[PDB]
Design a protein around this motif. Sequence first.
Motif, PDB file in Angstrom:
ATOM      1  N   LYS D 126       0.797  -1.235   0.000  1.00 22.13           N
ATOM      2  CA  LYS D 126       0.000   0.000   0.000  1.00 22.13           C
ATOM      3  C   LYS D 126       0.825   1.278   0.000  1.00 22.13           C
ATOM      4  O   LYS D 126       0.444   2.227  -0.649  1.00 22.13           O
ATOM      5  N   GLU D 127       1.946   1.276   0.700  1.00 20.23           N
ATOM      6  CA  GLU D 127       2.850   2.416   0.773  1.00 20.23           C
ATOM      7  C   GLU D 127       3.815   2.586  -0.433  1.00 20.23           C
ATOM      8  O   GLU D 127       4.618   3.490  -0.415  1.00 20.23           O
ATOM      9  N   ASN D 128       3.741   1.730  -1.447  1.00 21.39           N
ATOM     10  CA  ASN D 128       4.566   1.866  -2.651  1.00 21.39           C
ATOM     11  C   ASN D 128       3.829   2.642  -3.744  1.00 21.39           C
ATOM     12  O   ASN D 128       3.434   2.067  -4.789  1.00 21.39           O
ATOM     13  N   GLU D 129       3.615   3.937  -3.499  1.00 19.52           N
ATOM     14  CA  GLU D 129       2.788   4.794  -4.389  1.00 19.52           C
ATOM     15  C   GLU D 129       3.427   4.876  -5.778  1.00 19.52           C
ATOM     16  O   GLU D 129       2.710   4.919  -6.753  1.00 19.52           O
ATOM     17  N   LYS D 130       4.761   4.819  -5.859  1.00 19.44           N
ATOM     18  CA  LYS D 130       5.427   4.874  -7.131  1.00 19.44           C
ATOM     19  C   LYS D 130       4.980   3.702  -8.023  1.00 19.44           C
ATOM     20  O   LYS D 130       4.550   3.900  -9.161  1.00 19.44           O
ATOM     21  N   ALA D 131       5.051   2.483  -7.495  1.00 24.83           N
ATOM     22  CA  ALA D 131       4.574   1.316  -8.245  1.00 24.83           C
ATOM     23  C   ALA D 131       3.054   1.366  -8.480  1.00 24.83           C
ATOM     24  O   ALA D 131       2.563   1.040  -9.565  1.00 24.83           O
ATOM     25  N   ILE D 132       2.297   1.796  -7.471  1.00 23.42           N
ATOM     26  CA  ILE D 132       0.851   1.882  -7.666  1.00 23.42           C
ATOM     27  C   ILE D 132       0.506   2.776  -8.855  1.00 23.42           C
ATOM     28  O   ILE D 132      -0.391   2.472  -9.636  1.00 23.42           O
ATOM     29  N   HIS D 133       1.227   3.896  -8.972  1.00 23.98           N
ATOM     30  CA  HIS D 133       0.997   4.900 -10.018  1.00 23.98           C
ATOM     31  C   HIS D 133       1.342   4.274 -11.383  1.00 23.98           C
ATOM     32  O   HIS D 133       0.541   4.316 -12.293  1.00 23.98           O
ATOM     33  N   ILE D 134       2.515   3.656 -11.493  1.00 24.14           N
ATOM     34  CA  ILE D 134       2.919   2.966 -12.722  1.00 24.14           C
ATOM     35  C   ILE D 134       1.823   1.996 -13.207  1.00 24.14           C
ATOM     36  O   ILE D 134       1.455   2.018 -14.394  1.00 24.14           O
ATOM     37  N   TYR D 135       1.315   1.161 -12.300  1.00 19.90           N
ATOM     38  CA  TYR D 135       0.321   0.173 -12.686  1.00 19.90           C
ATOM     39  C   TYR D 135      -1.018   0.829 -13.029  1.00 19.90           C
ATOM     40  O   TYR D 135      -1.713   0.363 -13.945  1.00 19.90           O
ATOM     41  N   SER D 136      -1.371   1.926 -12.359  1.00 23.27           N
ATOM     42  CA  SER D 136      -2.588   2.675 -12.767  1.00 23.27           C
ATOM     43  C   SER D 136      -2.501   3.214 -14.187  1.00 23.27           C
ATOM     44  O   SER D 136      -3.433   3.067 -14.957  1.00 23.27           O
TER      45      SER D 136
END
Lengths: 166, 173, 166, 174, 173, 174, 166, 166
Positions: D126-136
């Motif tokens: 949940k705290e890996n916003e960089k990866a979350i953003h990439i996948y979005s």
Amino acid sequence: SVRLRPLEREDLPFVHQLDSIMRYWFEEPYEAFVELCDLYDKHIHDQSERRFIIESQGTKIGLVELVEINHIHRRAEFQIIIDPTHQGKGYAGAAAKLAMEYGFSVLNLYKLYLIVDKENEKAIHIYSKLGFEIEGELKQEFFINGEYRTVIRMCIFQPQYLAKYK
Amino acid sequence: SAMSTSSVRLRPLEREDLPFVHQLDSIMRYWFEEPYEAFVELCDLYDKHIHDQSERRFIIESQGTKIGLVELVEINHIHRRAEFQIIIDPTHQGKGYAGAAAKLAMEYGFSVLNLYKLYLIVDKENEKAIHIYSKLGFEIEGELKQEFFINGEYRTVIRMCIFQPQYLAKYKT
Amino acid sequence: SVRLRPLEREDLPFVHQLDSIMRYWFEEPYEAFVELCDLYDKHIHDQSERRFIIESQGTKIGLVELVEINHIHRRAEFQIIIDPTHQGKGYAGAAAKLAMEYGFSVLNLYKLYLIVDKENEKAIHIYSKLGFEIEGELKQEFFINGEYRTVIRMCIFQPQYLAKYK
Amino acid sequence: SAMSTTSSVRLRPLEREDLPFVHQLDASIMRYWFEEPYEAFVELCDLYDKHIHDQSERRFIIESQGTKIGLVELVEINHIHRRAEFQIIIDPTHQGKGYAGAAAKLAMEYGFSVLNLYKLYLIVDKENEKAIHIYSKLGFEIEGELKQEFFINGEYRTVIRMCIFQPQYLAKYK
Amino acid sequence: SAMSTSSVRLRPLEREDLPFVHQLDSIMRYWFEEPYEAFVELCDLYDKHIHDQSERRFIIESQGTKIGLVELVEINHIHRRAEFQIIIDPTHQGKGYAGAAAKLAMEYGFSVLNLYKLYLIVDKENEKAIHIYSKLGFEIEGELKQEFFINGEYRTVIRMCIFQPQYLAKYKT
Amino acid sequence: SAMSTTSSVRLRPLEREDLPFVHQLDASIMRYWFEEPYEAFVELCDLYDKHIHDQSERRFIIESQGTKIGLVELVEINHIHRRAEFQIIIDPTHQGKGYAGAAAKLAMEYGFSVLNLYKLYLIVDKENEKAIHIYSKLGFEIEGELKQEFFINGEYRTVIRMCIFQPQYLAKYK
Amino acid sequence: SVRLRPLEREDLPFVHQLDSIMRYWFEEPYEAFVELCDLYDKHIHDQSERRFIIESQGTKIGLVELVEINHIHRRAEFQIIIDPTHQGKGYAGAAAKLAMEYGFSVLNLYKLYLIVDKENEKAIHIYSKLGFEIEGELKQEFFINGEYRTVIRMCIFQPQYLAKYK
Amino acid sequence: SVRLRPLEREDLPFVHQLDSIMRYWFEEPYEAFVELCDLYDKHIHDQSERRFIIESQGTKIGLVELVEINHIHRRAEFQIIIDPTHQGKGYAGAAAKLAMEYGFSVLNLYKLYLIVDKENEKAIHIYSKLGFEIEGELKQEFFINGEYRTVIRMCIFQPQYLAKYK
Ligand SMILES: [K+]
Ligand SMILES: [K+]
């Protein structure tokens, strides 16, 4: 002066590099070379498939696969794969002739058949000139690279061969 | 439905169904693409292939008694297809069981296995089966010439197919 | 209304008592019943030989053995053994017909042959009437009961059969 | 066209000779081969041999310019439900260059166009916003939040499960 | 940290570490509760137990060279405990490695394995180790009397323990 | 006290002789033993033998008044992350009597008090509001919604993942 | 500064050449080196016997064998073999001391014993000085080089040892 | 006239029903009876644990388990389990005496010890009267029924036993 010789363990690296798309050894899938080696060992005395390296001037140029050999119904499917670096020189048709020789004159089969993509008119034409008739259109039979492809089944029989090429 | 062939269902093949299987037939028969004649051979092959999902078999039963077999073979989940064969015990022919079982085989392949294409092979001169499968929505895709040596002669077979869209339309409005 | 059915384990005691003279299962000798059982288990998926109980009116009357089945050369040897208690009723010729049916119409063989003692004119005559021609006289080929016996090899082919009986 | 900018990042099937590379991609966090744990290299080798024909997981070395830069793992491949999980691991020495997103695209190509899957998903902290953003940006929607699902380095971490379907892919990348 | 024993880490034991293990020592030694003396015996046992998670071993290394071994044994995840032993190569004693490695063993057991209790056993007369473990926060739980016959005499051992709360306090503010 | 109302529903460890009962609890929906599929009884028996010492799944027959009424399956037991999934199957002939909730309580007792787990979770179909309600009343919070995660009877179904933790349990049931 | 270390596979050639006379590994005979190797592999985890190379200044000088280790009765037999090239230097007595140390102080045994030829007064004397008492004379117990030899059994116990050498 | 006899396969159903709480056979867990049977077969020659049915007047009343038998350090742990239907009759103390007899007089051990819950004062008292001293308090050593329990380790030695009971 292209010829066939029996596939040997030391030919597997060559086989592995002829191609993303599923490949089968005795109807069992493999991707990695190690998987191919393991399957090769596991099926060494199984006569339901037979393979030959196509070679010309001593260099390896492709592979012949006879599969689904059935001696009661006296048929087999075959596939020719030519190394991409030796395509466009009519080795495919030369090897198809050798595959026919082998299936009809050594294995004593009555029918050989093959499968090709409906859109591969070049191969369809080659096989028509060798005496193969179209027997079937298998609709959406393979999912390849995101889409369902249609294939043509083509066949030739042992009397018409032991006339026309003998 | 009420006054009719109504109670036909499919259940998974079990070891104790093999004597029944063995007696449904002159003709080579195959278990996981391996031939057998004797019952002993069939038993041995049955054991040898028990977790292989490339073929699946169901006893067709009606009124509690065994009336036939469904075989899905060459199950391939990448291409999302399978071949099937319905075999009705000769003593239970002529009661519409073949078509009833064919419907159940289609249900299973398309709705449980998630297949996109089912197909089958029948003798060109098996007009009864050809008719049943045409009414169920199968189109003819292929005529395989002299594809089986049976009882001294080379027979020609019709390949027929139906797809998961035409099925989940025609039987799932 | 004599018919063939596939040999099953439970037929072995019957087989064992049809006969002092060496008997072979997959080219391996046996005398004791236990030896026969063991060999039967050991060769269960081997298609190079096939066996059938001959039965009429539900009682077991003999055995058919096809051996040396070779599907490339498309031939097999066969032997009919009739239980001594059912000899002299032409079951041998009835069973020979069924063996021919099976080899030519199910197995897709081109040639069937058989071996009989030169001095067994009764069997030689039966096989001549069924269409078998003599191809060979194997001289002193078996030591039996103290003396070397000579055998006649006889054969028939699949076209002449699928005419005359089809 | 001649004047494109393109990466030569590709995927090739994992081989036995890739295992030393695999082993050193991370003593600190449990790693799994066919859902079986390993720490030592020897254990990894043994498991690799033991599972060689099992199609429930598939692995690819990510390589660019002929050097090995990471690993793709598709796991829990299920062809009846037509789905798979995937994990991208990028070698620490090749991070920060958008190879993760490039490899995720290749993983999608393979799962949807070769394996004929309907759904791919992944798990990230949940705290890996960089990866979350990439996948979005690649088209993945968030499907849920697994609370305190992994004990890592002394604390229970929460993960986001993200997914994309075979229709939204064969639209957006065709 | 900068001018000090600083670069000590733990890595998983590998087959090629066994010669090192074999030479760290007169005294029975155990691999998965099975005795060995010869190197060959140790190799054989190492192979035999490779996927057993009831024990885990780490080479302690500093400045790239192998300096010792950590052994967690009797790992039980239902009771959430393990025993550990730190062994320092005699040629690298007296440089604070034991305490450095003990800290890493605690980190691993409590923060990776999710254990609630770690304990250890030392000779009653090993005051040096007793002192180190007292400073790290271990309390004495037990004095096991005449528990090991070593070099002709029965020795008494101290069992010491620390729990996951007192650890994730004292080393995790 | 003498004047309580109490059920005599209990759980006991699954035995080989329970398999015929297990087999007939459901040809229509894939069932899994140690993540391996089976349809035939023979296949179930084989898998049962093959996995007998594997602690990653644990099973209990639910029995009341000495008759067998259902099955509890804890699967994906992981003691490092301290969690497990569970599934309750109630025999169709014993449905509608609140045995599911009674058995879920026993499953919780076992997972939290015997296995020393920190988190238990379960999966149910989004459209099974009756079961969702039962699990909400037992203390389970919803953690997410897995979209089109199972192909069942011709359609892609969505499931809810629900969870409870070892603190909220050793409060609410102590 | 003679010491004991555990026997390793790579010590077997040394063992094989310390001697015509039967030799035993785990009570199983061997003559050829290959036989010794095979037995060594076969018995690797068996604790009923333990072996040690005796070494001084890094060179291998002999072998210690404890056999018939029984921990319920708390005894073992031991044999010292010294390489012929290192005999006559009192390594035998030095190694016997180490064998005693090991059996009594590591293995926790109560009794060690040994067997020597009645006519080997030199060895009998060495063992008497180390504290061994004679317990038995086994008459004609071994056929060696054409004749039956008589042996003396000698023993020492763990309390008298953990006094006199501790 | 309570006695010990060696555990036999046919005693396993009795063992299985003496108890929700993890049970161990050779340090391997089991719940189902089938698991217990399999482990029993797998460990049949392993001397690191030994088990005895306690029987009186021919009926089975409990189990003795010696585990972690180590003959170099000469110790073992033991556990007495009494069938719930035969508790409160001092069979526990009678069986503890027999366990002591066996460990010290047959196995030649130097130390036996046992583990009991800190709150089981009744058992602690019984073992104190038999001569066991407390050696340790293992804090929060077992998670049982939702809570961490503390256990007392107690021990007795072979000289004090072969005096006081011999
Ligand atoms: K999983
Ligand atoms: K799973």
